[PDB]
Symmetry: none
Subunit: 460 residues, 4 copies
């Protein structure tokens, strides 16, 4: 019965190519060390929920205002998901509302923009290379469909120039202030941004994606106390699937003493109209189920213990890097991400990242505060949200730092052999050169011996 | 301690609520009759590929222009997926390019819009009550609803209410006055084929691009039973589920090679849609692609290239024709006479009722249906037609005699609708009708009907696991 | 000293160049036959009003809401002007308002566009070649700042296709539909356009610039019966200065059946804000005084007698031209214009009109349905009211008909001698032939001796 | 018969109402004292040229590319006018071009905007409450008022509230963040000179154009007493009256010739602003130009090229310095310390009052002035400064002692205003101030002051007629 078995044949028997590809990817992820702030591993429950039968049911609409029938279970599931989302951050249901229909973070941001900014409006957000539009063309859709004037961080101290921000806000008259960032270890002053938005009558939007889990454990002050709209995601902190969440205020905005009447919020209806049928159509029920499972798993004491272990291991890694003689800029860090400058060592960030990738070591490259050169980014970024989930410890992070030191010594040897005056092309030519490849091979094997010890969460 | 079990505990033991919800949903879908056109059941291979470790790896960028390291396996997988996509439609790789980065159909449509329309431009697509989609342009005189109508200027063309076919003459006359930049060829409720040759001629006369939307007929194009629009259209946006039995994703096919030749100088002009689409998709709108979705699309495309898929599509169209003839045998008014696809539109005005009441009554007896307006209706909030789809049941093993039995069941349901409407009068409202559905008078009849249809549905298996 | 003379010396003593230029222009205008429909001759009263001391006063704003002090006289003058404007068309002041601040017709159109179209909106109006935007670029500012698609008349008969207009407007959803014409001299069904606007909830715009004074004499049905906003100029019919007027509806728009309430018109405030301080600044008081004098002179029986003489002379000229074998197209026209065709003779309108300008006869080409090319026009439009303002009678119009017949004969002779396949520059060179120069000089002497008998209105 | 009596009747016999209105206006202008900066009396030659028969002739089009016929005289007049305009400012015809077709300053500004800014672009002009003009961009948080703010995106820069000079540093820092396409250099209530070199450097660093507006100094640049901005600016729009003694019109000067050369290929780039400006003026916004206005501005430009004009401008600046020193001696605070142009701004916060009431009190005694906010005022509804213009009275033949007498009269008026304000209290509203002004107690004093100033002003003639 091959005709009936076609819909029931396993993946190993149906397509061996993708099966071998997935097996090789799992083998690489198991024996390869990962040091990336955005990299993590999801639990098995969310993986089982993604492969559920909810991928077939079409559920356009909202509970009580659906378009199709037989959506009682879907409505109950989404209600449970939104209740768990509201309870995870300890928010009053009468004043806060959550939406999980957007597919990811960028669609959620675009929906919020179409709902609030009234395209061709004015936005004020943080600059891209400081943690986006050009004079010749516009790359990001936010600059294409909307007008934005970014504010620059102070190049001397490294903090937001609040006086210049207020001046540019009162001179530009924006409609929404973006209180979000990608590379900023210091905590933002949400109260000052809130009072600025109240003085200018604009809204405040925060982006707590990269810290979505850090706020869950109460390690970072919650931005829900001042910001009106709070957009975030579910991965890179919560070990969940790829989805987006939007938090908006509900209730009375401010009572008007001129007429004695009160004004109610209107963000809920605008957002609900912007998500559907504005941009997206049928939501992903499996994604909502995975998000609900991740949110329920995050509301346990084990999540707080894991976050404490994360911050402790980050502090231990910073201390180990400082002990060996490395210069950690910006006075360490106040979050999980770690930024180090290897300019004084005599090695470039991109070359070091390439040599680390050659020996099964992962990292990230980004510019440093006060951009001085776009061709030589020396802001090598480190993070361990996934190694802590696997079961790494500070005594093991000492050996990880020893491996990083061996890698930087290999990079120094390569730069001394090929020459510091050599361009990037001839350097890329000598990554797999035999001259020292055996040494590089050594830098691989021991690393593998360190990777096969710890297990890999997921499906067996 | 408990940290090792937290990342390894099964969902049945971790969260019993969502487990019971999924079990109840599967039990409902097993004993139910699904007649929605955009409804199908994915295979086990796609479900297993979606729940792989690819959800952990971040793969922002394009092959050869990646931003991070260690992307060999992801690049190989995406290359295999795009090769299978190009081979599934028998397209020359030197003349056609495929992109699978968009998350779904609407993101792909918005990406093509921001790439080619040059926002604040002019768009002409199919009207929504005439079988169009929300992304094809929809706006009223009061305010704009769809994002395509907000960011762009859309003017949809009307369909001929007498014969039911698209009035190509009115479109040609309006193209000279409106001067559009891109013509949308996409249908959601339409039982006939489109004249892509005349649309391409009009686009060349007006100097505009052509964007086809083969969402429903996609799998049909995989079987060769429907003329492929790749012969005339420039851009082609399509989905992966619906009928192709894949995960929720979108695919964009664009032209490559020489677009035109200058007769005077002789210089060869090359296409420029590839770079624009690649820039609009990333980092224009979306960020990190879903590797699991790409793997599922690749598996579905590999499974579609078999003869079993063509046999399944032939059985789908045969059961569609059988259901159509069995329903027109009972005296039901069918628009346009027949159907050239899997979806059919049954008109209820010949029975003295509307589509909403019949859809709700079918919903009461576990019969999946959807309402839709007919060409020539005086109001959009009171639809008179019902949309039925064959492949949802055909994927389970339904036959011609079984389809005739389901047609008799829908006839009995329509008789029940007429009885309930005559019991509450002709001047009643819809709330009173819904209250009469849950009444004790018709409780026994609808209960017996639901039990009968559930016993009939329990004989066929349900794919998944 | 010299300061007492610099601001007191006449124009003849100050600058002799512009003085001689004005003298030559007046001499040319004295001996000649201006056959353009747009040209006219203003009275001496408005000429003295333009040279008044009102040019020094720099006033801004509207009466009762001025910015500077001591504007009582300007406010009284503007009130008298608007009262005379309302009384000239027999309009109820409680339902109609008039504004004279716009400088000309196109500024008034742009002001009402910024007031009622909400730029980046939708407009529906007649195109250029049927009495405007290209496929590559945009020429008019209306297509640049606003989106618009034109509706075209049927090619067989030439009347407005109202059914196709309804079918297009039902899907295009226009915000304001205009009703104007420059070469389509057939009456428009304003009731059907009003019904269309009420069905689509849009506004109706009228352009009575060509028939403005013709509405003052009651010869043409007034478009104020159905149209909401009616713009018009001040010259070419009423013999006034360069200015424009905007008429808008006032009162209750419609009754609200929900609670028995009523919706009042708000076009007044929008038009006022768009005019000032939207586009223009300080209005021209001299222009206001001139248009006020013109409106006061137009409300007399002499104006109606002049319009009757205009239409009688137009009928007589059309009959005299038809008698001489010249095929008049569309049976002439309705109000004041005639259009002779020369395609039956063989020569185009361009050669005839350039020979006419060579023999001191003022004519101009125009685009009409049938003449698919502007470089080779077949339509020669003339103008009646100028000769009537100069005092020409029926026998005088017959003499002008004999003169234009002789001119067409001379043009045909020139074309036959130079060849029908010759280019335009060959025709220009043949126009300077010895015998042709003698003939055109004789014709010029004849027409100058004919025109010297009739006086020229203006300053002594 | 009737046509000889209607079209030849004088204005006094035809319409007596407008005749009496004009007579009353002339009497008010002769007996009253005007101190507004944007006020002047045109010569009799311009008034005679305005009333010529040129109003009848239509001149739609450009010289050499006309549409109608018989325009040789109008073409020669426009050529003479543009030649006089080019020669008045000592500009090379091969490098500069002039256009006089715009009707006024605002239409010319809008034409330059729609020609160069590429609407929906970004502009940076001077703020309205900081001495700027309304056409230079002005918008609030609730809605947009100016058409420039509606069609374009404008972000104005403020003036230093401490010293009173334009903060070029803040403008330079904001130019890199806003990325403007055109920088506006213009003002209406600024008593100092502009640093056009710094603005040109900022524009070259940002790659944007520099649009100058020399309206209030249109005459000052003619006599060479103020440095000309043509050395750095590309496009300069100006008026024809205010301080030039001409009719209502506007002029636009644009650069011509080679803009820059390519260092790599060696090919020189030519300017393209001429064609864009010509297309934006006609048939972009306006239609048929005013030949009488062209003749009047030509006469004014020919009269301005004499030595009497330079002597008049020197007398204006001397009387302005004398009035400034008299106001400083009278204990009144002068903004920015002095004035380098014809206009001055006197602050009233040093005496404990505002300009709103003082303006109307001066108007009650036949003293014309205008209120304006001072740099540092927290509310635009209560302005504190008063703007005074010397060239309005200098055109009649006043001297330093005459301006000192006017300053003494203004001081007495300010004393009366302070007395009236103290009589009604500080917490009183402006309407209560108006009602208290109607009382005979102060009405007798203001009437005596009005009689005195009228008897003083009647001793001087009034140009015109």
């Amino acid at each position: 019965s091959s005709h009936d078995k076609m819909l029931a044949q396993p993946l190993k028997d149906s397509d061996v190519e993708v099966y071998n590809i997935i097996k090789k990817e799992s083998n690489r992820q198991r024996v390869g060390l990962e040091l990336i702030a955005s990299e993590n591993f999801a639990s098995r429950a969310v993986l089982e929920a993604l492969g559920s039968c909810l991928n077939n049911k079409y559920s356009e609409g909202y509970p009580g205002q659906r378009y199709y029938g037989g959506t009682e279970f879907i409505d109950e599931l989404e209600t449970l998901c939104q209740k768990r989302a509201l309870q995870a951050y300890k928010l009053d249901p009468q004043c806060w509302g959550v939406n999980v229909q957007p597919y990811s973070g960028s669609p959620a941001n675009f929906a919020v923009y179409t709902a609030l900014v009234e395209p061709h409006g004015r936005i004020m957000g943080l600059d891209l290379p400081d943690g986006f539009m050009t004079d010749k063309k516009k790359i990001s859709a936010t600059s294409i469909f909307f007008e934005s004037m970014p504010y620059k961080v102070n190049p001397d101290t490294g903090y937001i120039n609040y006086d210049q921000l207020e001046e540019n806000a009162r001179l530009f008259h924006p409609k929404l202030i973006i209180a979000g960032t990608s590379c900023y270890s210091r905590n933002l002053e949400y109260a000052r941004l809130r009072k600025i938005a109240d003085e200018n009558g604009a809204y405040l939007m925060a982006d707590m994606a990269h810290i979505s889990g850090l706020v869950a454990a109460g390690v970072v002050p919650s931005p829900f106390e001042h910001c009106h709209v709070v957009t975030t995601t579910t991965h890179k902190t919560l070990r969940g699937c790829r989805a987006g969440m939007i938090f908006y205020r509900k209730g009375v905005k401010s009572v008007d003493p001129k007429t004695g009447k009160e004004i109610l919020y209107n963000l809920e209806s605008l957002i609900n109209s912007a998500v559907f049928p504005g941009l997206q159509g049928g939501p992903h029920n499996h994604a909502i189920a995975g998000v609900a499972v991740a949110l329920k798993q995050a509301m346990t004491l084990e999540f707080k213990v894991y976050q404490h272990q994360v911050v402790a291991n980050c502090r231990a890694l910073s201390e180990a890097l400082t002990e060996l003689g490395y210069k950690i800029v910006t006075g360490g860090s106040d979050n999980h991400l770690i930024l180090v400058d290897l300019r004084s060592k005599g090695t470039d960030g991109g070359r070091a990242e390439k040599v680390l990738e050659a020996c099964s070591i992962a990292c990230n490259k980004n510019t440093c505060p006060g951009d001085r050169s776009a061709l030589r980014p020396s802001g090598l970024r480190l993070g361990t949200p996934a190694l802590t989930s696997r079961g790494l410890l500070e005594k093991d992070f000492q050996k990880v730092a020893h491996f990083i030191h061996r890698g930087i010594e290999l990079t120094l040897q390569i730069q001394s052999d090929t020459g510091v005056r050599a361009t990037l092309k001839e350097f890329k030519e000598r990554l797999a050169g035999d001259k020292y490849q055996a040494a590089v091979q050594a830098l691989r094997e021991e690393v593998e011996s360190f990777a096969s010890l710890f297990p890999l969460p997921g499906l067996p």
